[model samples]
Target chain A: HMIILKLGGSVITRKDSEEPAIDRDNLERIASEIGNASPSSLMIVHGAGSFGHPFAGEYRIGSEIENEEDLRRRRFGFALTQNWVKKLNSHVCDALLAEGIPAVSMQPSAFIRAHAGRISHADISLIRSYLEEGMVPVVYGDVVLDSDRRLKFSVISGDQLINHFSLRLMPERVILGTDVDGVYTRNPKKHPDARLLDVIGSLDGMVGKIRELLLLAEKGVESEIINAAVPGNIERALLGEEVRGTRIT
Target chain B: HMIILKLGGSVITRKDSEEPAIDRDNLERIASEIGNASPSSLMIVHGAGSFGHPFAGEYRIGSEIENEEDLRRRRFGFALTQNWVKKLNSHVCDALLAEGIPAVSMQPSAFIRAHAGRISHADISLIRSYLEEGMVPVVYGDVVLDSDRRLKFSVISGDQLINHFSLRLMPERVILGTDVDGVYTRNPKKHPDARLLDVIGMVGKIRELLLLAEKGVESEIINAAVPGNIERALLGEEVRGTRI
Candidate 1:
């Protein structure tokens, strides 16, 4: 079993900015903290952050490819998106390597195939093999070949991939390192009365509340939504410390 | 038209050592020289250097897949070799990127598959597309899956990939950058009487001589060698040594 960590786009990158810029300080801390943990088997799945969504939105790449113009724009956008994601990935991997972590970038587009916005095929065996050899495999959101689309392209989000891999790899824990501490009752940024939930016993209980949040449905694995921006929090979570984040059992 | 450059293992890394070590000074100079040329469309293929060969040799990954034992060793070796090559690729890409080159590392194993020791199929259309967009594609010698072997793998040498792409892309020119000036009459390091061929006008004339050197037995060959000569050949200026 492995520990799957998802570094939300906002944490590692300036998600609000249209231009691609990584939050270098946060990225280094998270990488250093995780590097310190030295988990026996760990696979990092990161969001594209500023690198992906803006481009995807700019070209309407998330939608099904329709015509020639759509194909043209989507292909260009796909290349740009792939380039940006790889850029972020390279930096993240570099940081990890700087900290003595043997992190290998596993490009989703290289092996993952999708259809209708969902992953149709992903050669996870290679990932498992890397993990077997004690190498940390780092993956990111990417533009993948879509068998269903006439244009033959689709964007795979990191969130969807976390859920997909959690079910397959059955990692011991899934830690989603986001900007916030955990799931709040409402918009934490908008409401003054918003309160963080220390424990989310079940998704069924927070169905309506969780819908609007970054939380996704759990597939038999308990997830801890922790604030990675706070120094030492990632290490705490990795070391089995019940940090201040919300836990969904 | 495009130019394809292959940096030999010896040129980029210390091949004599079992450990993976890069010739950083040489690498930087080559990158700088190529960056100066600023070719419109450039695709680079690099040898594994110390990053790949020793491990591959230890496991016999270049050969056919045999039993569970060979399979086991090669699997481990493939991962190690691929990782080391990527590590080198990242540094090379970083150097190029620092120099304002839009270079991207396209892992060979990710898209190319080999049958036995030869590449059976490679998705080069994507690479071509990248080139068409004015992005330089940096690929290197890698460990790839063998369709002919069960759970087996093979090493795709940079030399082999250069030849493969030369015929397919039919680039305007192909340059091989190595420690020596060019193909020599004998070992340049040991033989004082050795002479470098100024120009290889025809393979038909040097077939036996080429066969005797590391030029190896290939269906075809190209001219141009040495690091300092890269910018010249890349700038559309014919260099002094080895022109075919």
Candidate 2:
């Protein structure tokens, strides 16, 4: 019943736009597809893309603090980062709402904190409340508070969240909405001859820490990387239909 | 079982600070008091004093956009204002967490919007979800989208939120934590002989809009002026305040 939907930033946003802009058409279409499937216990995690990366880079967020001025700048950067990401989140929630989903926004910084730049503790009970009540939790990759004294704070990527939920919730499958159809043998941006592997060995290629954590657990999860721009792929995957995407066991 | 507690910006924040800062002592103490009571159906809504007002003033937020540049500036101001408010909101949540309350931050911008500078539409189901399940829903005054056209978006005061819930949820009583003892006969700042009033006419004294609607659905406001008054009022004990 637990299915994690990870939408790549590149899919929902014009990553290289003049400013942060949402790909409204794709977002709406995706929302419609998800509404049609209405996967139960589904939590959405989206990448920041144009909404956040620029602000993070401009302010040098997620780096070790050097000076008081550096800390001050990063704090402001954190505020702006949170605002932009939440703005995109508002759009995501609105889109899903239009398609008849009781979507609720859950900010990572509010519930989760990191230690050594990894999610160490979180009040997942609130998240569980939404999922258990059959409400959709719309979360995203965000800069979270760090217990790690050196870093002070860092970014928790959407992929990292998927991994955390993968082990914690032990979802039956994780659907990653991406610009590509699936994983390739090689970087096809360079090698067009590279083949799209129908099956992948594991999640280490997606998120390094996840594979490491999976070793300690006896359970296994299924993950699929599918084209986000192409409509109906997310629907098919959510409905357990055969989607033309690479499946990871 | 429904209870609405509204913390004044002055009580929880250094309203006139050189920089935006939380009055941690007061915030935590209040959280502790509320925690000690552990009210079954509690929702905390705080005001935006230092965290939001200055930014709103500086960027001219909650105003009609003048030009493309002005709109651009206001948009950034919106972000900054939202960030600061939410930052303060995070502190409130943390304090309640320490007090053993599962406080969750709920942004007005995320759920409620204004038609013409007032609450027009909202998805309060989530707030209901939290409250009905015995989880604390922490909300506050912030800038929200406006449908009035002239002003694309504006601030919805926490008092406004209190009234909205008062009518919609029909809480038995509403507690307002303030810095003063209670209502006065006159403005003490101007009138040295201003005496504290033991009773007041109605909600209009606190929020004008509430008074207009209360005629249809009778409601009351319990002001918690002193330190221990908040805990006492939450626990259903009578305190020294004007009941309106």
Candidate 3:
């Protein structure tokens, strides 16, 4: 019934920058692309590339720790991480605003909660309200407070967040915008024989543990892994035009 | 069922300061007072005085405007207002954290919506969820995109937000933390003979319009400027303020 696009932070941000930076031109271009598409409904779940990953990594966030220093640093990291990521989110909203899209910036920390780093409890009815009002809900990766006593906070990935929404809303299709072509049999960047799979029946063959939550075959949600770094792939994929990518249903 | 507290922006912030600034000592103390008392279900909502008012006033936010420049400036104002208010919210959360309250910062813009500058629709189910989890939800005033085509965005105040929460949650009591001792027939600070009002049955009788008492919601407007006033109010003492 809806298309949920996962903008891997790397696609819209300068992943390698020591300091957090958005790929402004690229993001603006994508905003224009989304504005022209998705009527029916579009929910954006963006990753925390440089804006979040670096700070979270330095703080060793989400690790099993109850020590005072760890807790203190994690708290500091939570504040700074959300601050940086929110600034990024504002830019995303700004670009969408420029494109005349009714985009609302939704913070994961504010609504979604985690139990031991997994989506445990949430009241996403607010999101449904936004969507029903014909407003696009823009969500991003964030540090969420946890239910586990040992882990008071966790770095929840955007992919699992996608699952969180997918489970709740039962979207018809999920478009994954990433730097890579798709689910390749091997590393496509380095190896000559690497091949992209046209169809995947299961998530069992996925390389990263993170993508395991990206798709649940039994749910029958159609998902596409498209390389959004290319100029027109995102626009083409959103428009239902022929764009090469792996599909999972 | 719960105690909702409104920290007037003037109570926690320096109002006269040209630039926005938080009264750190004042806020932290009030937070500590709250912690000692609100193991009790408490929801905090603070106003956006210096943090928001100046920008909103300069931009003429929430007023009748559809001009190209008005739209552009309001957009700029919306971004700046939220950014400033959220920063204030962070400090409030920080103070609460020091007291060991699992405080979750809730953005009104995200959940609360307005139709022509009045709160028309909201999904505060998330707030109920937070309270059930034993975490205090800290909310502040922010710019909300409105449903009114003429008024694309509106500046929502923290006072009406209390009404928004109190109406749904049916809070047992609402504590208003203000600077004055209580509501008076006349300006208490300026008049020597003006008496401090202890209770009022009708907002129709009052002129300042701070009184937002619903059918069953008990409201107490106490001077939080005093050191022990907040703690006293939290401890269920008959503290000084206008009670409704």
Candidate 4:
């Protein structure tokens, strides 16, 4: 009865563009199917792609690699990112509701906890109430209130909220819709012998591997491992069979 | 049981020449008496002696008096009288309540009606409400609303309300407490030979005699007949005492 759907950044917005990456037609289609399905106790969490990542990365936020001034700049930049992401979340919720899906948008930045440079407090009374009323609670990555940089930090990772959800909510599954065909063995583009890992235990060493991939990335990963260019890959991953993407336990 | 009480200005306010008119002490005494008497229904009305008579007579309000400006001045004079009387009424109610006698003051101006030169209507609904609620309704004499002047005329005769009250309410007695003891054979001040009449059925003729006594004296009794207090006199005598 418990389900958690992670809407990939690529599926929501285009890279470096405020426009939604996933077309209304595709979202409507998904909402229409979900409406018919009426899955019980389901939640939708989304990543900040074009709506946030470009701005956040440009300002170098939450990268674990910034000076004080850089932190200030990134804080300001992520504030801009959070603003647009909220608008994007509103658009997504409206799209789903237009298709007759009873979904509500939630800001993790406001309602989650911050422990390790992330949300550490999540009061989900309202969220629990909505779920009890058969309503979908939609959450988005956002700037959070924290003591990290003498100023309230403005960048958050969906991964953090998902971890919070796993610890508290303990949902059945957390789907991750990435652009690439799952995690590769060696390197998909350069090494033809490279293969995809359909299932994985955790995100351990993924950051290091993705850091290495960026060095050889032809289109330039640009320090962002999440490629926000391919949105159709996300729709296919959610609608079709377990996608050709890395799955973490 | 219907009861009527005429609270004299002497009992409710201070008189300039005579005794303490409209005396707070006397008002408290009378109010306490009324509360103890516990009459089933009662209508209380008071005169504007300290307030109206001095001003009205000084201004010669109803004496077939003057030009438009003079009339306007007279009306203002009357309004001045009415305000003073209303203040006296408010003070009386406050003093009465202080004495543990629950009394409510109803402005008779709202009920006092006039046609041409006479009081034509007496809407006693508010008075009836007070009586029905078992609270005393005190009324008084003052300038009333007049359509012609876009103001009020000084036609406040406390006795008129008392008379209308008697005719309508049919109370047991309407006691009038004035400066003098009662109706005298002559001016008690001028004639030591004068005697107080305990009951006078021929009040109409007595009014004529009083007029003769004031001949060449120039008084309100000429036009209005001092009938203001006479209404309560009639209510008290005609309704209660059995004349011999």
User: Which candidate comes out best when scored by lDDT?
Assistant: 3
Residue-wise C-alpha lDDT for candidate 2, range A122-235, written one tens digit per residue: 656556744654567778888766666556667887777877777777776788898878777766677879788787664423344235334423356667789989989989
TM-scores for every predicted model: 0.65, 0.56, 0.68, 0.41
User: Each model's interface RMSD (Å)?
Assistant: 5.3, 12.0, 5.0, 32.8
Candidate 4 reaches a DockQ of 0.01
Taking the tens digit of each residue's C-alpha lDDT, what string does model 3 give over B16-52? 6767889888899998998787646878889887888
Candidate 2, residue B215: the lDDT equals 54
How accurate locally, in lDDT, is each candidate?
0.72, 0.73, 0.76, 0.53
**Native-referenced Cα lDDT, model 2:** 0.73
Better of 1 and 4 by lDDT: 1
Alpha-carbon DockQ of candidate 3: 0.17
Candidate 2: where is the Cα deviation over 4 Å?
Answer: A202-219, B1-244
Would you list the clashing residue pairs of candidate 2? none
Model 2 misses residue B146 by how many Å? 29
Which residue pairs show collisions in model 3?
Answer: B1-B172
Choose 1 or 2, whichever is better by DockQ: 1
